[PDB]
Design an enzyme around this catalytic site. Structure first.
Site, PDB file in Angstrom:
ATOM      1  N   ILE A  21       0.854  -1.199   0.000  1.00 14.59           N
ATOM      2  CA  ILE A  21       0.000   0.000   0.000  1.00 14.59           C
ATOM      3  C   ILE A  21       0.893   1.254   0.000  1.00 14.59           C
ATOM      4  CG2 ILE A  21      -1.598   1.431   1.403  1.00 14.59           C
ATOM      5  CD1 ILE A  21      -2.961  -1.180   2.303  1.00 14.59           C
ATOM      6  N   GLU A  23       4.493   3.259   2.536  1.00 15.44           N
ATOM      7  CA  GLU A  23       5.234   3.334   3.793  1.00 15.44           C
ATOM      8  C   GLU A  23       4.421   4.134   4.782  1.00 15.44           C
ATOM      9  OE1 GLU A  23       8.918   1.958   4.421  1.00 15.44           O
ATOM     10  OE2 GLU A  23       7.488   0.845   3.161  1.00 15.44           O
ATOM     11  N   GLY A  24       4.308   3.597   5.989  1.00 11.62           N
ATOM     12  CA  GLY A  24       3.729   4.293   7.126  1.00 11.62           C
ATOM     13  C   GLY A  24       4.787   4.864   8.042  1.00 11.62           C
ATOM     14  N   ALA A  25       4.340   5.509   9.119  1.00 15.61           N
ATOM     15  CA  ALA A  25       5.251   6.196  10.031  1.00 15.61           C
ATOM     16  C   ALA A  25       6.285   5.264  10.685  1.00 15.61           C
ATOM     17  CB  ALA A  25       4.465   6.943  11.100  1.00 15.61           C
ATOM     18  N   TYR A  26       5.984   3.955  10.881  1.00 13.96           N
ATOM     19  CA  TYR A  26       6.959   3.036  11.521  1.00 13.96           C
ATOM     20  C   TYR A  26       7.348   1.787  10.707  1.00 13.96           C
ATOM     21  N   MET A  28       6.552  -0.816   6.775  1.00  8.06           N
ATOM     22  CA  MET A  28       5.778  -1.132   5.580  1.00  8.06           C
ATOM     23  C   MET A  28       4.320  -1.408   5.895  1.00  8.06           C
ATOM     24  SD  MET A  28       6.378  -4.256   2.960  1.00  8.06           S
ATOM     25  CE  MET A  28       8.098  -3.846   2.765  1.00  8.06           C
ATOM     26  N   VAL A  29       3.419  -0.880   5.064  1.00 10.51           N
ATOM     27  CA  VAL A  29       2.006  -1.219   5.098  1.00 10.51           C
ATOM     28  C   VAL A  29       1.715  -2.002   3.792  1.00 10.51           C
ATOM     29  CG1 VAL A  29      -0.349  -0.339   5.421  1.00 10.51           C
ATOM     30  CG2 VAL A  29       1.597   0.974   6.326  1.00 10.51           C
ATOM     31  N   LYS A  44       0.068  -3.209   9.015  1.00  8.01           N
ATOM     32  CA  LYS A  44       1.247  -2.394   9.268  1.00  8.01           C
ATOM     33  C   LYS A  44       2.296  -3.286   9.937  1.00  8.01           C
ATOM     34  CE  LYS A  44      -0.360   0.805  12.106  1.00  8.01           C
ATOM     35  NZ  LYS A  44      -0.442   2.122  12.811  1.00  8.01           N
ATOM     36  N   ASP A 135      -1.776  15.113  16.194  1.00 10.78           N
ATOM     37  CA  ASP A 135      -1.153  15.090  14.903  1.00 10.78           C
ATOM     38  C   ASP A 135      -2.149  14.888  13.802  1.00 10.78           C
ATOM     39  OD1 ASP A 135       1.123  15.303  13.201  1.00 10.78           O
ATOM     40  OD2 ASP A 135       1.620  13.177  13.317  1.00 10.78           O
TER      41      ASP A 135
HETATM   42  C1  LIG Z   1      -2.721   6.508   9.949  1.00  6.26           C
HETATM   43  C2  LIG Z   1      -2.244   5.698   8.757  1.00  6.26           C
HETATM   44  C3  LIG Z   1      -2.779   4.271   8.727  1.00  6.26           C
HETATM   45  O1  LIG Z   1      -3.308   3.798   9.730  1.00  6.26           O
HETATM   46  N1  LIG Z   1      -2.664   3.531   7.569  1.00  6.26           N
HETATM   47  C4  LIG Z   1      -3.566   2.380   7.370  1.00  6.26           C
HETATM   48  C5  LIG Z   1      -4.190   2.425   6.002  1.00  6.26           C
HETATM   49  O2  LIG Z   1      -5.369   1.754   5.831  1.00  6.26           O
HETATM   50  N2  LIG Z   1      -3.624   3.074   4.998  1.00  6.26           N
HETATM   51  C6  LIG Z   1      -2.340   3.582   5.183  1.00  6.26           C
HETATM   52  C7  LIG Z   1      -1.552   3.855   4.063  1.00  6.26           C
HETATM   53  C8  LIG Z   1      -0.276   4.359   4.207  1.00  6.26           C
HETATM   54  C9  LIG Z   1       0.234   4.599   5.466  1.00  6.26           C
HETATM   55  C10 LIG Z   1      -0.527   4.336   6.582  1.00  6.26           C
HETATM   56  C11 LIG Z   1      -1.818   3.827   6.455  1.00  6.26           C
END
Ligand SMILES: *CCC(=O)N1CC(O)=Nc2ccccc21
Ligand SMILES: C=CC(=O)N1CC(=O)Nc2ccccc21
EC number: 2.7.11.24
Length: 335
Positions: A21, A23-26, A28-29, A44, A135
């Site tokens: 999907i 990259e997320g804050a911590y 791979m998603v 995540k 945030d």
């Molecule tokens: C706050 C970000 C998050 O929970 N997600 C979950 C999601 O369904 N989509 C996504 C895509 C990229 C980064 C983080 C997330």
């Protein structure tokens, strides 16, 4: 174990046919097919020394239950502390987020109105639990194919603490710069509900034009962006700033004229701009609260306090100890 982009993503056998999907804050998603509920889900990956923000988020999201707040559906980890390394957090799949959507899509006034309603509905629940998200920004607002909205990323959230909100001028802050209220740069630790309302105001403005309203490039430039639109604060609002370094900074600046909201947003609904004005109020004590924002004429088509639930009760909170707490908090998902 399956692999995505040359990296392990070890979530089977329940979850199969992974697709990246982002990259997320911590970490791979990916999306994956959930073979139990027969739906694709988002997962995540968290790799560790772990981060207190992983624990804070898990505790909060496991306690919260609201239509406009992302839930945790499952947590995958080894059965023992000794074997535990990566933690995977499984959530509902969401088509997109407001950050992606604003890069390429003009929003109708109906979409802006509905999105803002849902942000505030979710925020009402968060604030009712005496929690601050801290945030809020487009990328933390998830959207599905029918435009239902869910707030995510509670890693910077805190219990509200207005009696300890005061700090000196130029105190370093962690939350994303463009959505920071002016007081963060002046005298605030971001421990009051008003900090989240400012972020929502910023989001609303960004929905109206597809551009961030206050894109500061560094700490103090963020404040100067804000004053460049609101204009110089009034004597009364300056008298509220007792910190001398902060007050004298503001007194040192040239007079700045207010930019009328209807000149920045010539296409905007007039009621949206009256609500925007109230959310982007310089003085946090004068800034609209979440329940008043819900009750604003802009949102009259949706406002229904009986259908805007609150939390049952207020929420309350070394590396080895942190890992043990993550292990314990995630125990309910084990077979
Ligand atoms: C706050 C970000 C998050 O929970 N997600 C979950 C999601 O369904 N989509 C996504 C895509 C990229 C980064 C983080 C997330
Ligand atoms: C420079 C501070 C200041 O003038 N005030 C105003 C006050 O009336 N009393 C007061 C009490 C506590 C903190 C600050 C203050």
């Amino acid at each position: 174990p399956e692999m995505v982009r040359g990296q392990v993503f070890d979530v089977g056998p329940r979850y199969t046919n992974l697709s990246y999907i982002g990259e997320g804050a911590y970490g791979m998603v990916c999306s994956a097919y959930d073979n139990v509920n027969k739906v694709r889900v988002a997962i995540k990956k968290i790799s560790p020394t772990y981060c207190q923000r992983t624990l804070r988020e898990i505790k909060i999201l496991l306690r919260f239950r609201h239509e406009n707040i992302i839930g945790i559906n499952d947590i995958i980890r080894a059965p023992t502390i000794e074997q535990m390394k990566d933690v995977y957090i499984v959530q509902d799949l969401m088509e997109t987020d407001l950050y992606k959507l604003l890069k390429t899509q003009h929003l109708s006034n109906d979409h802006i109105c509905y999105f803002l309603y849902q942000i505030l509905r979710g925020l009402k629940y968060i604030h009712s639990a005496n929690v601050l998200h801290r945030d809020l920004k487009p990328s933390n607002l998830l959207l599905n194919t029918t435009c239902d909205l869910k707030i995510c990323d509670f890693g910077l959230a805190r219990v509200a603490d207005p009696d300890h909100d005061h700090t000196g001028f130029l105190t370093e802050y962690v939350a994303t710069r463009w959505y920071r209220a002016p007081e963060i740069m002046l005298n605030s630790k971001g421990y009051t509900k008003s900090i989240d309302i400012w972020s929502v105001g910023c989001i609303l403005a960004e929905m109206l034009s597809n551009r961030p309203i206050f894109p500061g490039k560094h700490y103090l430039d963020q404040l100067n962006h804000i004053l460049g639109i609101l204009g110089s604060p009034s004597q009364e609002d300056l008298n509220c700033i007792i910190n001398l370094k902060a007050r004298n900074y503001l007194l040192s600046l040239p007079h700045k004229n207010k930019v009328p909201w209807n000149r920045l947003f010539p296409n905007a609904d007039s009621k949206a701009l009256d609500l925007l004005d109230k959310m982007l109020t310089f003085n946090p004590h004068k800034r609209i609260e979440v329940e008043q924002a819900l009750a604003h004429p802009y949102l009259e088509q949706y406002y229904d306090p009986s259908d805007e639930p609150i939390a049952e009760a207020p929420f309350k909170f070394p590396k080895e100890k942190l890992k043990e707490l993550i292990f314990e908090e995630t125990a309910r998902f084990q077979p």
